[PDB]
Amino acid sequence: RISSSFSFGGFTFKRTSGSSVTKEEEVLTGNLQTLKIRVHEGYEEFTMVGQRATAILRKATRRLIQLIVSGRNEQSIAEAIIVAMVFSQEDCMIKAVRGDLNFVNRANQRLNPMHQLLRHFQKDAKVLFQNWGTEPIDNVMGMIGILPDMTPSTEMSLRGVRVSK
Numbered sequence: 001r002i003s004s005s006f007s008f009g010g011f012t013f014k015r016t017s018g019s020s021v022t023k024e025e026e027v028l029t030g031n032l033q034t035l036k037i038r039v040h041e042g043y044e045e046f047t048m049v050g051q052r053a054t055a056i057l058r059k060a061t062r063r064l065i066q067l068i069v070s071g072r073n074e075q076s077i078a079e080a081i082i083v084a085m086v087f088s089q090e091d092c093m094i095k096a097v098r099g100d101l102n103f104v105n106r107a108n109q110r111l112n113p114m115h116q117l118l119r120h121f122q123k124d125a126k127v128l129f130q131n132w133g134t135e136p137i138d139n140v141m142g143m144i145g146i147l148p149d150m151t152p153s154t155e156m157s158l159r160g161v162r163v164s165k
C-alpha cells in the first residue's frame, strides 16, 4: 500500500515536477576520501515536510537551483537547509567535508553515502555554510535572506536559498 513520497533526513519528500535517472559516480571529499554516490540527473521539484519545518526545492544534476524554507526558529530552518544541501549532491557540499565518512549506526552498520554526508553535516555545518556561497538579494515580497550563520538578512542570502515570511 504505496505512496510516491520518501523520507530523507527526517523530511518527507514528494516530487512535484520533473524526472531523473541515476548513474554511480566516484567523488572526492574535502577530507581526501573517495566516495561512490548515486548521482541523480534531471530537473526536479520537491516539497519537503518535516516536524518543525517545510520547504520547496528545485534541483538539477548536482545543483540546488532554489530552496524556500519555512520554520519556527533558526535551528529548525538550518536542519531543513542542511538536508536540502546534502540532497542536492553539490560538489561544494562534497568539498566542505572535513572528516572521515565511516559512520555506523547502533547496529554497527555503515551508513550509505548520502546518510554519511547527512550525519557529518548534522554534527557540524559550519564549513558547509561558509563554502556554499552567498548572493545579493532583491526585496521580494514575502521572502527574507538567511546568512551562513543562520541569522536573517534583507541584503544577502545563501545562494539559491530564501526563508518564507
Ligand SMILES: CN1CN([C@@H]2O[C@H](COP(=O)(O)OP(=O)(O)OP(=O)(O)O)[C@@H](O)[C@H]2O)c2nc(N)[nH]c(=O)c21
Binding pocket: 006, 007, 008, 015, 020, 038, 040, 044, 059, 087, 088, 089, 112, 114, 115
Ligand atoms: C539525491 N536523491 C536521493 N533520492 C532518493 O532519496 C532517498 C534516500 O536516498 P539514499 O539513502 O541514497 O537511497 P536508497 O535508495 O535508500 O539507498 P541504498 O542505496 O542504501 O538502497 C531515496 O528514495 C533516493 O532515491 C532522490 N530522488 C530523486 N527523485 N531525486 C534526487 O535527486 C534524489
